[PDB]
């Protein structure tokens, strides 16, 4: 009853939302995006997301496919394995559809804790 359930959701979204820019900038160059930290690889033409999987102690960040070249749908997920009881095991998913380049946000959290802009 005292869990920070609303703030957990906001924190999780705040960890993945900025990555949309990172992805779009890479794809605009015809480079692929890969998970994790590191340097750009000019041989394979891959740009890392630049964030560690465990940057936010509420959970883990993942990219699929990895690497991603823009010719298939891309998903960025935040899995809340470190959250309190209401949100533990819940997943926020950002999907970029390749056909139109549009992004959507879905969550399997209880409706009252889903962040603004995301749907079930």
UniProtKB/Swiss-Prot annotation:
Location relative to the cell: Fimbrium; Membrane
Gene Ontology BP terms: cell adhesion; type IV pilus-dependent motility
Quaternary state and interactors: The pili are polar flexible filaments of about 5.4 nanometers diameter and 2.5 micrometers average length; they consist of only a single polypeptide chain arranged in a helical configuration of five subunits per turn in the assembled pilus.
Lineage of origin: Bacteria, Pseudomonadati, Pseudomonadota, Gammaproteobacteria, Pseudomonadales
Primary location class: other
Organism: Pseudomonas aeruginosa
A GO-annotated cellular component: type IV pilus
Topological type in the membrane: Single-pass membrane protein
Family according to the record: Belongs to the N-Me-Phe pilin family.
Keywords: Disulfide bond, Fimbrium, Membrane, Methylation, Transmembrane, Transmembrane helix
Protein name as it appears in the record: Fimbrial protein
Shown segment, full-protein numbering: 35 to 150 of 150
Cystine pairs: 105-118
Superkingdom, natural source: Bacteria
């Amino acid at each position: 009853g005292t869990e920070f359930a609303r703030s957990e959701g906001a924190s999780a979204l705040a960890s993945v939302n900025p990555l949309k820019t990172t992805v779009e900038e890479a794809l605009s160059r015809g480079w692929s995006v890969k998970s994790g930290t590191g340097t750009e690889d000019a041989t394979k033409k891959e740009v890392p997301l630049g964030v560690a999987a465990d940057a936010n102690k509420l959970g883990t960040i993942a990219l699929k496919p990895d690497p991603a070249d823009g010719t298939a749908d891309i998903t960025l997920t935040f899995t809340m394995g470190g959250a309190g009881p209401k949100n533990k095991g819940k997943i926020i998913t950002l999907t970029r559809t390749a056909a139109d380049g549009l992004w959507k946000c879905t969550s399997d959290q209880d409706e009252q804790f889903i962040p603004k802009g995301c749907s079930r």
